Design a protein around this ligand. Structure first.
Ligand SMILES: CC(C)CCC[C@@H](C)[C@H]1CC[C@H]2[C@@H]3CC=C4C[C@@H](O)CC[C@]4(C)[C@H]3CC[C@]12C
Ligand code: ALF
Ligand SMILES: [K+]
Ligand SMILES: [K+]
Ligand SMILES: [K+]
Ligand SMILES: [Mg+2]
Lengths: 984, 268
């Protein structure tokens, strides 16, 4: 679209009004600069941190607690204005509720996406200076003033300032890893080659650099109008959406808020029916609101996520967005880049054909694989040729590095041969010391081979050797003999056919193959003193002795095949999206396990059946390779057909925005897509993906700015660890949420029984705040340390539509059975405290009016004694303390039964030390609140008689026994009615 | 803009009501009915076992009620403030009705069964009969039902009863008395009629509702007089126990422990 390589030299120059050699006039340049704008990328506006905190302050439970604080202030105002002797109870309650909202907002703010600096990273890719021709003179100017249609000169590693239409080039090559992710240099020529501007040779793109040569070009786009500028704008404008854990959190927030609103409004209007005062009604509503809302639930979730993130931070896996922890566990599809992500981004020797045999060398970066045999004399000769006909040389001051991981000055092929020789045998410095190079002829465009004549290995004066490397099937056209185990024999036709089979077989693995041979002087007819520097000498290079073939490829990382296998076992569809050529993409897919053995593509089936690809039924092939050109004009519906029916998909030659198209197509089927990449062309895909993972060492700055997680050590098994930890934290979050929600009922029910049966209040609001914000925090957090009940890597990825973090079964279980047992235990303790002090349970019915009356100071108990207001209020507050302690006692068994969901509690053992400390700390905090001096004035907590601690013991035992029996029924009948209704 | 909920209720296929079928609804309601029935049975059994350990005569603990409070009768409508109009019988009718309803056990007619006890001595009863001492209504002279039909009302001199809180097995030491004084500088005269407060020891100790049948707590009646022409309204008067060390009356947390403050206003 909008191509400028079609126009001729004059047609391009007349469109822009630019002289071919004189350049652009300064006045016209200034006019165009004022007309179009500066050569710069505009950062996208960012929401200030002030707003984001405020946004977090108004979500779900926060609104209910805001209503509670408002009602507390209103109650204080009413109390003061009416009875003129105020107590600082409702005011302090409102202040505490507001502080709780602020702290919960802080916790939510920590657990939030921290935005990205992608556009800043692109601005690090624009050059600071540009060489521009104006008035027929070279000048170095600030790149921001570079306008369209002026002569720009690039050379010698300089980054291209803007998209150029190259009109002159002297051996120019550019690195297009920003557009294709592939670092092999691309030649730039003035002539038109290909229709597509990305693959054509005369266009030079912004954010790329000229590795070698010089080029004079014409600017065709500037600033945001460049190809990479539009990609940067797209990446900045994109958002990752709502994470799945955020959706689950919003779901159960909606459920709990709806229940709270229903109960609050129903019982508030009921209290107005019963002719309660406005102050009494608002106090009751505050109690209901505090009882229904779990104050410490969201902070607990944030702490669990943080702990799991720290668990992965130890394994060299850095989690930037806290919500990204569970997204990997929920992932069902992984779109993977090839180079740098799955492969090692380094050209390495893979196979050798010699001894009429194929030997596979070790390609792993850590060298954990086995090596081949070094015992062959022709192998010694081949290693000598490969390491001695090599122009590449190691860069200095890095001898303290592994050979494969050290910088080399030379081509990728030359460096691959250099490193292979270094690992295999000796060192190239000493090889050149022993064999002094006396002449060489480098690679030629018309010869396609390189030779070097140097001193013999036999040390004899007359003998020298010529070593030659070149194309495989052409180099033996000059050869006539071969070395076999150190013995030379003439070239046999069977040997030629075997060579052809080996060349096609190594080439069939997507590897560049090269042939190496040498020749010795026949006799003394050519003396050593003869000068070989004579150009076009009449000494043809023929009748050589073919030595061997060496193949090269960018090999997969060591752990990538096993990681892909584990992910496929976990039910994850792993798609391969690459900007490289289709043949290499298919070869790497077969190598790492994207395309399994025994599965064929439509083209492969056609080749097998010797029929055109049209006759092959596309439904037969379960694997497909889709070229970028086909993906371009392909409509969305056709893309959805490819994803649905093919199980092994490889997209090849994909532009950066086509990766985005593929990611959106995958997400269109309701899938959680994780993208792994390490280049700047993956940044839109990393932004759009549900979770973006970028490599640490090999990753570019843009990729790690656009990603949610970074593999710091570039270990691809960290993906397996991440999905396992995501599934584990999902299960443990279910457990923790169930435990937190269970204790709500012992706080809701006292208010309802209060308003219904008009008994004295069994539980206070401050006591409720002491439960959730206090004794319930550490035990709830401790569930995050639970181990997996089984192998969680065998189950399929969870369905976001069907599987909820909080479903009806969890709500049903916690609110209806365990919560009601806990409420019964608390009410029994309440009745015991009141009965043993004089107020029998029958006498409590209808006593609310007199008990709460500050002026009636002769309330008669069941024994004829008369109590004042404060005397009976002390008993009521003791009942509140005992109710709190009873909730703690039943929460003991609640924690024990929430430790597991299917297996026996003592089956797995007490591996979780944090849970035991949680039990002990909960009990210790309860005792400290009860018995510390001054707690009768602060929280109205009062000392409990020792026998009163055991009132709730029978109900805790009932909870434990009921859960154990239910679990036993679950395992005996997995498809039973109990499992369909209780299991969550 | 789509009603996904409408199909969710009353699904024609499978007959699922609110996401659950008729059979499954029956099963889940039956399960919850049986579960809550078992829970209620366990709670009832545990309550009955707790009640079996209790004593019907005397509470297990008395540490939360060590000293008696002081209360006035009848209870005013709002904030323990007596308001009435001398010319309007209906204003002070409720006080009259409450006073006659309360003082009915104290008259000579009903307490003929009760026994006269020697004065000034604590009456300890080890025996199981637990007979009660009688309180003559003549002790509240000019504030009792016999002298006048209206308990001081319509004369500008209302009568109010001050009574000590009942506590089981409480033995006051010393000579307990109740003294009432006006707080304002106008000091309208207050006259506790049975001499001083003079709570007699012969009524103590209280032995409970079950055991000590027919107990009549000692009563102290006050009369705050007002002038015929001068209403003398908004008078605050405070009564307290100052004759006994056992009965504490200086507490700060509880303003009704051993004392009581009440306000009187009169019209015309
Ligand atoms: C103090 C007493 C009255 C409280 C009683 C609470 C009861 C009646 C409430 C609280 C939780 C509620 C349950 C919550 C979950 C479910 C599962 C759902 O699929 C059907 C409704 C059902 C079964 C509800 C029935 C009514 C229920 C059990
Ligand atoms: F590293 Al790529 F396409 F292989 F960006
Ligand atoms: K709560
Ligand atoms: K993302
Ligand atoms: K809770
Ligand atoms: Mg890459």
């Amino acid at each position: 679209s909008m191509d400028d390589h079609k126009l001729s030299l004059d047609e391009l120059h007349r469109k822009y009004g630019t002289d071919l050699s004189r350049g652009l006039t300064s006045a016209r340049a200034a006019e165009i600069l004022a007309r179009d704008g500066p050569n710069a990328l505009t950062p996208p506006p960012t929401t200030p941190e002030w707003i984001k905190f405020c946004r977090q302050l108004f979500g779900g439970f926060s609104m209910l607690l805001w209503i509670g604080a408002i009602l507390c202030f209103l109650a204080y105002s009413i109390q003061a204005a009416t009875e003129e002797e105020p107590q600082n109870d409702n005011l302090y309650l409102g202040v505490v509720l507001s502080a709780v909202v602020i702290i919960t907002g802080c916790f939510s703010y920590y657990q939030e996406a921290k935005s990205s600096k992608i556009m800043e990273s692109f601005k690090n890719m624009v050059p600071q200076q540009a060489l521009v021709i104006r008035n027929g003179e070279k000048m170095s100017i600030n790149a921001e003033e570079v306008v369209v249609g002026d002569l720009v000169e690039v050379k010698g590693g300089d980054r291209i300032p803007a998209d150029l239409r190259i009109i002159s080039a002297n051996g120019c090559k550019v690195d297009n890893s920003s557009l294709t992710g592939e670092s092999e240099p691309q030649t730039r020529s003035p002539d038109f080659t290909n229709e597509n501007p990305l693959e054509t040779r005369n266009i030079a793109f912004f954010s790329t650099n000229c590795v070698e040569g010089t080029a004079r070009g014409i600017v065709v786009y500037t600033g945001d109008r460049t190809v990479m500028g539009r990609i940067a704008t797209l990446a900045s404008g994109l958002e990752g959406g709502q994470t799945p854990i955020a959706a689950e959190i919003e779901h159960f927030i909606h459920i709990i808020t709806g229940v709270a609103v229903f109960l609050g409004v129903s019982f508030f209007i009921l209290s107005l029916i019963l002719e309660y005062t406005w102050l009494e009604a608002v106090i009751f509503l505050i109690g209901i609101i505090v009882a229904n809302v779990p104050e410490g639930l969201l902070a607990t979730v944030t702490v669990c996520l943080t702990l799991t993130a720290k668990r992965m931070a130890r394994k060299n896996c850095l989690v930037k967005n806290l919500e990204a922890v569970e997204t990997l566990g929920s992932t069902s599809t992984i779109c993977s880049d090839k180079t740098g992500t799955l492969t090692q981004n380094r050209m390495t020797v893979a196979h050798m054909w010699f001894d009429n045999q194929i030997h596979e060398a070790d390609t792993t970066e850590n060298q954990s694989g086995v090596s081949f045999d070094k015992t062959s004399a022709t192998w010694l000769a081949l290693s000598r040729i490969a390491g001695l006909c090599n122009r590449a040389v190691f860069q200095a001051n890095q001898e303290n590095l592994p050979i494969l991981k050290r910088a080399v000055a030379g081509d990728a092929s030359e460096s691959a041969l250099l490193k292979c020789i270094e690992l295999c045998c000796g060192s190239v410095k000493e090889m050149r010391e022993r064999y002094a190079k006396i002449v060489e002829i480098p690679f030629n465009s018309t010869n396609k081979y390189q030779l070097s004549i140097h001193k013999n290995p036999n040390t004899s004066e007359p003998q020298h050797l010529l070593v030659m490397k070149g194309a495989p099937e052409r180099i033996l056209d000059r050869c006539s003999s071969i070395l076999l185990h150190g013995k030379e024999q003439p070239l046999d036709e069977e040997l030629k056919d075997a060579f052809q089979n080996a060349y096609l077989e190594l080439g069939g693995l997507g590897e560049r193959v090269l042939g190496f041979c040498h020749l010795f002087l026949p006799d003394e007819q050519f003396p050593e003193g003869f000068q070989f520097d004579t150009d076009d000498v009449n000494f043809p290079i023929d009748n050589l002795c073919f030595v061997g073939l060496i193949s090269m490829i960018d090999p997969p990382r060591a752990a990538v095949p096993d990681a892909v296998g584990k992910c496929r076992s976990a039910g994850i569809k792993v798609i391969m999206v690459t900007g490289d050529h289709p043949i290499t993409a298919k070869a790497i897919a077969k190598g790492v396990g994207i395309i399994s053995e025994g599965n064929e593509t439509v083209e492969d089936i056609a080749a097998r059946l010797n029929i055109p690809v049209s006759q092959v039924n596309p439904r037969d092939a379960k694997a497909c390779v889709v070229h970028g050109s086909d993906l371009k004009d392909m409509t969305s519906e056709q893309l959805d057909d490819i994803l649905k029916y093919h199980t092994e998909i490889v997209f090849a030659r994909t532009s950066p925005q086509q990766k985005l198209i593929i990611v959106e197509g995958c997400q269109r089927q309701g899938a959680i897509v994780a993208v792994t990449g390490d280049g700047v062309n993956d940044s839109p895909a990393l932004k759009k993906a549900d979770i973006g993972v970028a490599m640490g060492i090999a990753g570019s700055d843009v990729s790690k700015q656009a990603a949610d997680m970074i593999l710091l050590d570039d270990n691809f098994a960290s993906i397996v660890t991440g999905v396992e930890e995501g599934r584990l934290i999902f299960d443990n979050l279910k457990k923790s949420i169930a435990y937190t929600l269970t204790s709500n009922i012992p706080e809701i029910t006292p208010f309802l029984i209060f308003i219904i049966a008009n008994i004295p209040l069994p539980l206070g609001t401050v006591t409720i705040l002491c439960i959730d914000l206090g004794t319930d925090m550490v035990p709830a957090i401790s569930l995050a340390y639970e181990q997996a009940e089984s192998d969680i890597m065998k189950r399929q990825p969870r369905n976001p539509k069907t599987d909820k973090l909080v479903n009806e079964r969890l709500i049903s279980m916690a609110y209806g059975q365990i919560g009601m047992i806990q409420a019964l235990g608390g009410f029994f303790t309440y009745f015991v405290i009141l009965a043993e002090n004089g107020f029998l349970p029958i006498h409590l019915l209808g006593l609310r009016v007199d008990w709460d009356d500050r002026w009636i100071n002769d309330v008669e108990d069941s024994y004829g004694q008369q109590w004042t207001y404060e005397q009976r209020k002390i008993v009521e507050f003791t009942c509140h303390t005992a109710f709190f302690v009873s909730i703690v006692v039943v929460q003991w068994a609640d924690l024990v039964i929430c430790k597991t969901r299917r297996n026996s509690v003592f089956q797995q053992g007490m591996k979780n030390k944090i849970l035991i400390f949680g039990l002990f700390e909960e009990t210790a905090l309860a005792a400290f609140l009860s018995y510390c001096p001054g707690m009768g004035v602060a929280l109205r907590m009062y000392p409990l008689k020792p026998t009163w601690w055991f009132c709730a013991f029978p109900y805790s035992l009932l909870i434990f026994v009921y859960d154990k029996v239910r679990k036993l029924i679950i395992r005996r009948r997995p498809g039973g009615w109990v499992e369909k209704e209780t299991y969550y | 803009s789509l009603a996904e909920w409408k199909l969710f209720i009353y699904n024609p296929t499978t007959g699922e009501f609110l996401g659950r079928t008729a059979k499954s609804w029956g099963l889940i309601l039956l399960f919850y009915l049986v579960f809550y029935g078992f829970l209620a049975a366990l709670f009832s059994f545990t309550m009955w076992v707790m009640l079996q350990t209790l004593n019907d005569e005397v509470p297990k603990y008395r540490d939360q009620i060590p000293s008696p409070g002081l209360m006035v009768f009848p209870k005013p409508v709002t904030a323990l403030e007596y308001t009435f109009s001398r010319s309007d019988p209906t204003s002070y009718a409720g006080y009259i009705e409450d006073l006659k309803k309360f003082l009915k056990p104290y008259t000579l007619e009903e307490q003929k069964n009760l026994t006269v006890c020697p004065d000034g001595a604590l009456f300890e009863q080890k025996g199981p009969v637990y007979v009660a001492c009688q309180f003559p209504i003549s002790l509240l002279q000019a504030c009792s039902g016999m002298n006048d039909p209206d308990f001081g009302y319509s004369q500008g001199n209302p009568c109010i009863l001050v009574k000590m809180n009942r506590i089981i097995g409480l033995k006051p030491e010393g000579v307990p008395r109740i003294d009432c004084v006006s707080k304002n500088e106008d000091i309208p005269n207050v006259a506790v009629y049975p001499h001083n407060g003079m709570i007699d020891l012969k009524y103590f100790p209280y032995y409970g509702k079950k055991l000590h049948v027919g107990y009549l707590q000692p009563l102290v009646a006050v009369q705050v007089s007002f002038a015929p022409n001068n209403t003398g309204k908004e008078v605050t008067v405070e009564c307290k126990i100052d004759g006994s060390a056992n009965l504490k009356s200086q507490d700060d947390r509880d303003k009704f422990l051993g004392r009581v403050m009440f306000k009187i206003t009169a019209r015309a």
